[PDB]
Design a protein around this nucleic acid. Structure first.
Lengths: 97, 198, 95, 106, 82, 198, 95, 109, 80, 98, 198, 198
DNA sequence: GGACATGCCCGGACATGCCCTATATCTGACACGTGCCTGGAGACTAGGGAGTAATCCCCTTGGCGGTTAAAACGCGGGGGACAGCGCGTACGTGCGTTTAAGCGGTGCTAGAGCTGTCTACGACCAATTGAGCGGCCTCGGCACCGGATTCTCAG
DNA sequence: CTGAGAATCCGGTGCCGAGGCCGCTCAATTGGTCGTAGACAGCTCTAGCACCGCTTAAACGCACGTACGCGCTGTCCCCCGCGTTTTAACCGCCAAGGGGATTACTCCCTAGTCTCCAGGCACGTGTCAGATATAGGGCATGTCCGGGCATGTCC
């Protein structure tokens, strides 16, 4: 049957998700992860809805920006595929690693 | 079809090119070619002359094949064939199968192929050089449905692919052009050429 | 009946001044309030530090102006200083 | 009758509220009369600039109401605003539709 | 006690995040590093948020605590209070 | 037909050329030739003189053959023949088969061929050097349908191909001219000549 | 005789003599130590002030200072500093 | 009148409780300041000074130097993960950088 | 003027060496000069702004220390 | 033939030498002339304290050394050794200075 | 033929009359009737409605026959038939013999007769009474050559004779009309009507 | 077909009449009836409500049959059926044979007949007296080809004949209306109504 | 041969397909009204912080000279950047499955938030004085020089 | 393996800046008072957590093909490293002046308090724009036919 060329659908998805504003991380697993990490900081914590939404907005913005920088570093090396070493370089140059 | 025929222009060793007559765009001219669009506009069952030009003469046994495919990529795998109505009507010339879109007129040595592997229809004739004075060989095609026929081309544009082959069917050269089969070739040609500016 | 603090009516008046045909959503209003409060805190803090560094105990217009020049980009700083100066001069005359 | 300093100044942000927020922010023991006027005036100016650009972006999007997306477009498209808000994340703002040239097809 | 919730951050979610960041192709090995990075972010942000919560004599992390934590980490977030 | 006869002019070793009388264009003229068009205009069954000119005399046993083909390329493979009406009417001269378009008048040694391989009709006579005192040999052809005959030429123009051949049928020379068989040769010749300026 | 200029030089030297009785200090290095101490001072006092403001608190206490230290200082450093501060404050209160 | 003794001595600290208290009062941080806040602050500042000076002394002796110079302070700060984190955005004048060569730059046999 | 040439090629090489690079392209030097110049424009702007607010005519070391601090890189050793 | 080290040995030697010490590497007076030149483009007839220029110089060298560290790391990431302008531009872009 | 069919109008016991539609004289109307001339003008193979009117209903088994004869007395004995071209072309509807001029369309019970004694062609259908709520019965004829067809009617006018017959062929009634089969019925009808004044 | 179904209106013992909705003549109109023309204009495969009115209730077992015939007399004997394209497309509702033009929608007791003797298609449902609140029973027909379908109705107008019949198919009543199946019913209805004045 | 006789072709224009767009219906969230109350405005007061003027001195600017180390320039070469090519494998794309995320309703109770009270606690102020800073002096750590030792590199 | 170039180390000499001591002064301490703010109790009522159920869209596992990362090879160019020339950076030394810090006097500018009143903020409410489907409205493109030309015919 019909099959799209490698790259067209990836670009279509990039345009699609950069045009819109809905959150891309699932609510319930993000909340579960946040709560799991929290048990080791303070017991039986309760979290407001707007607090979990705040953590999710911050996390998605941070990851999107990090992926932007990672993509720029990969393309700089005449590559297209992002590597773990790309993430590590981006975070080291940003100064958190 | 399991495959899609290549449409890449390939003049090959013999410098194979197509040529077309200079018919104008009177409303109902029977067959008219648009250089701007590389597109033939023609009426159903009417004569469509296509000139074969070569820089040098291919060997005896060389054949010329014509095949239609849909131009739009999502339709490319669909075999181009006649609509159910024209398939059934009684217009066969005694040589062409009823479901073949493209016929050659005026050639007793015409062969019609229904490819067992690709399911593609095609029509093939022996290549004949021109006389030493003349400069090209003309083949006369007939298209046996309108582009608009429902259950057939259903308003989808097609390409005609013309290939020059040796006696085994190996590729010697290839050219192609778009085709619109319609009631008013001159009207429709001028409309599409005008829309180029839009 | 818990009174809060927002600039909603003033933002709406400025918007109607610049574009008296456009509305604003709740999320957008929240973003505008966050923005204005953030700027306010930044400018007031820089002015406070400026005053302390210079052994000044009063918040006056010169530290505000200098802080604006430090924080705002070129054209933004120039236009803001011009508008602030004209407005303060008109008020001072009006008393 | 009572007439406010903003009214005498022809400005929209409230001189009294900015003054009170300065007085209660534990910033200095005294505050001059002109300082909150200047600060309020700068805030009007910046608000007018941001709402101007966001309205423009909304009209380009055939929208009559500004949304966070339009605010993000306004801040990131303007060179000086992006600098001023270089370390600021606007929620539901998204990113600019920017594609690197080397990644485009040949 | 929630256990192994890190597996809830799925591969397609990270792929979508990369798409929004402009990434066209993603190695299979990307995911564990991304997960680690995400985890690191959470341990720092939540630590500050909970610290504020405990100072305020509260047991519920508020939106303002998180926004303030983000601000003091330089990643100021707009939309949940100033 | 499986093939198309060559129409290339070939004067050959003997300097073979055609000549025609200088008849004018009275609408009623029986046979008139147009140098501008290289086209004969003639009435059905009327005498059409064609002169054979040679620079030197071909050997005894040399023959002269005439064959018609359609001029338009898409009709070239269709055998030129009489229409069903004229085929059936009782006008045979005792020598010519009823379906042959072209006859030779006044020659007992005329032969009519229906080619088994090409299906083409032709009429052949022995070549005779000119009578002493003459510079050319004249052959008298008759055309037995109008160009307009329905079910026959059906308004399609034809060429007459005249070949000089040896006793085995090998080509010695070739010439050709267009033919219109019509009711008013003079009228139609002037019309087509005028249209040359259009 | 110039104006009174305050510094931590004598206190840095006393701590140094506690931890390294036979080690000295250069003027450039002492200046670096003073810059360091002043920077930390500014960070801690500012964060504590902001913490107190956020909670509608008008008094500077030891809880905001300790929490600010925990925010700014890394893990084991925070634990040791908190332990030292609590012991020191309880001993002072005993007096 | 009772003999005058300072709060720093009462707390077993070297940094001046009175001076830190005055700087808190005059730093425009709040109208009111508790008695224990400057004690706590002095204790944290003294602790950080003692650890940085300890590490700088170690580096100085490793270099056979008896006087602390900025180089030793920079080495001490950068050689400690927690101090390096705390001072991630601080440049020490006359401090230099840590000796470090990436493996890819070393020669190969 | 021409004074940008006073930060000579060997000076950029030495700074780069302390940055740990082993080889330096010929196109590096102008780039470094541009980066350095931009940095200076931003720093000196802030320093002079502070100097003018204090109603002074000479930029002091403390002016520079405040400029560097607000630029996001605190400099130790020059007061404060 | 006179002695000559292969490319790199002397480079490493200067790296070790300048990473061991802390004395300034950029010339004082040309930098001073540059700073005063750049400054008149903001305010004419400006003066500079000596310790102000030394502070600016210390800051500049620390900034350049850090930028060159990051540039080197980016070059090594690309399996390269020689740094080029695009490396500088990537380092500054990722840092958020562009 | 050995004989000539009578053409005398005979309404007979059932008051048999013909009627025709009021179609105007548009140049190329498919079928138009002239009351002035009692003449139908129609195109080849096109529908020609003829109405059968009766005063009272003929018995079951009554048939309606149509036959053409040449109108001019000297041609009357010549059987009217299709020309050689149309006779040979492939247009039979599966019911009508190829040489019959006159066909009935849309009637499965049509019979075509080639009279063994007279050699005349004719086409016959069963007479169907009009629905008791109707006035006439319409039969639809097709004429399969032009009046001008060479080798056929060859420009000679014909009459169509319509006879009402019993089961056995016994004359119940007779009517007739002239027919011109031509390319432009409206043009030709107006011309002949004008010429009536000349 | 060997025969033609009667189209005579016959209200019969039960006073059988048809009724239609008052739909106007706009764009996006799927079914509209013209009282002036007694003609339904509808879109392909859209719901066409036809009301059955009776003065008194027919016995249980009474059925309602619908059949199409060509309106023009020369086409009357040709069975009305779907064109080759729609016949082949995959749109059967599981109940109707693919070649039937007329379907009834929303009736499990629908029967489709292909008459062995006449070859006519028809669709029949049990008659049900009107629902509480109505003086008529509504049947919903679908027409599954456009009047213009080539190889099908081919632009020829049809009549729908609605017959009220008994169990043994005996006639209790008959009514009919003209139908045009088309893309723009409102447009086409207004056009034909306007032309009534021409 | 001129005047028709008579078929054929096709541009005009209608028949009649199909998409194409702009006009008709919901929803909760945003835009406006109201009441109130509390925070902002007018007025008067003190007092102290800031403006201004004179002074002094130090510390910034400018100049001269030398001299030497560093910058500039030339040139050889080698090794590293970079382009091309092959391959194989890891990732993109699609499809069927399943899994859990999402949404809607419902509970309840933990805990945020507000109010009242009062007492501990920090601002404030005067007297004291002793801790801390500026200045002066000195000596020892470090820096500069030179020469032998060791390391390290490349041929 | 070895020679040569660079770095390291070891010792001697000097020098200048860090450490210590002393005078002084002003800023921290102590003692007392008073307002106020926040710690605690108590009541409210909001919303966060927990659960159930249904749906469906997203995740997941896998098949497959192929594009890209990566390794290898060749090339050439351009940067390193070293020798030679130049130049200007630096150190020292001196002169001047100007502006930065200091002090004293004054005055006006803002906190503080009181009194009042109007603006801004909960509470309430209604209606308008988002999606879909129906009404215009364009194209999309086949068939018929009147006009005008082509071509036969003949007294």
């Amino acid at each position: 049957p019909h099959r799209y060329r490698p790259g067209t659908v990836a670009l279509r998805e990039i345009r699609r998700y950069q045009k819109s504003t809905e959150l891309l991380i699932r609510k319930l697993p993000f909340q579960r992860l946040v709560r799991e990490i929290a048990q080791d900081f303070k017991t039986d914590l309760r979290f407001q809805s707007s607090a979990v939404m705040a953590l999710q907005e911050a996390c998605e913005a941070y990851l999107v920006g990090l992926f932007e920088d990672t993509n720029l570093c990969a393309i700089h090396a005449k590559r297209v595929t992002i590597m773990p070493k790309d993430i590590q370089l981006a975070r080291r140059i940003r100064g958190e690693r | 079809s399991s495959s899609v025929p290549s449409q890449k222009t390939y003049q090959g060793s013999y410098g194979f090119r197509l040529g077309f007559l200079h018919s104008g765009t009177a409303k109902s001219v029977t067959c008219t070619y648009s250089p701007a669009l590389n597109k033939m506009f023609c009426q159903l069952a009417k004569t469509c002359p296509v000139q074969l030009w070569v820089d040098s003469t291919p060997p005896p046994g060389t054949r010329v094949r014509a095949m239609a495919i849909y131009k739009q990529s999502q339709h490319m795998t669909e075999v181009v064939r006649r609509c159910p109505h024209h398939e059934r009507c009684s217009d066969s010339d005694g040589l062409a199968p009823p479901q073949h879109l493209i016929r050659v007129e005026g050639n007793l040595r015409v062969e019609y192929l229904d490819d067992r592997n690709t399911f593609r229809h095609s029509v093939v004739v022996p290549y004949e050089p021109p006389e030493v004075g003349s400069d090209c060989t003309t083949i006369h095609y007939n298209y046996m449905c309108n582009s608009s026929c429902m259950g057939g081309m259903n308003r989808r544009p097609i390409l005609t692919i013309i290939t020059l082959e040796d006696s085994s069917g190996n590729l010697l050269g290839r050219n192609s052009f778009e085709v619109r089969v319609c009631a008013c070739p001159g009207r429709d040609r001028r409309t599409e050429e005008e829309n180029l500016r839009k | 009946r818990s009174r809060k603090e927002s600039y909603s009516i003033y933002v709406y008046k400025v918007l109607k001044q610049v574009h008296p045909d456009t509305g604003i959503s709740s999320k957008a209003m929240g973003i505008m309030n966050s923005f204005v409060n953030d700027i306010f805190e930044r400018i007031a803090g820089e002015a406070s530090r400026l005053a302390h560094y210079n052994k000044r105990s009063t918040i006056t217009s010169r530290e505000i102006q200098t802080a604006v020049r430090l924080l705002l980009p070129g054209e933004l700083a120039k236009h803001a200083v011009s508008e602030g100066t004209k407005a303060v001069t008109k008020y001072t005359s009006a008393k | 009758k009572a007439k406010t300093r903003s009214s005498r100044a022809g400005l929209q942000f409230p001189v009294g509220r900015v003054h009170r927020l300065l007085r209660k922010g534990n910033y200095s023991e005294r505050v001059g009369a002109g300082a909150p006027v200047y600060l309020a005036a700068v805030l009007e100016y910046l608000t007018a600039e941001i709402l101007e650009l966001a309205g423009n972006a909304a009209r380009d999007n055939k929208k009559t109401r500004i949304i966070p997306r339009h605010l993000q477009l306004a801040i990131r498209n303007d060179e000086e605003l992006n600098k001023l808000l270089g370390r600021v994340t606007i929620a539901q703002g998204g990113v600019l539709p920017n594609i690197q040239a080397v990644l485009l097809p040949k | 006690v929630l256990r192994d919730n890190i597996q809830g951050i799925t591969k397609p979610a990270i792929r979508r995040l990369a798409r929004r960041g402009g990434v066209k192709r993603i190695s299979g090995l990307i995911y564990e590093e991304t997960r680690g990075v995400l985890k690191v972010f959470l341990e720092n942000v939540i630590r500050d948020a909970v610290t504020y919560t405990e100072h305020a004599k509260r047991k519920t992390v508020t939106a303002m605590d998180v926004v303030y934590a983000l601000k003091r980490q330089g990643r100021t977030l707009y939309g949940f209070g100033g």
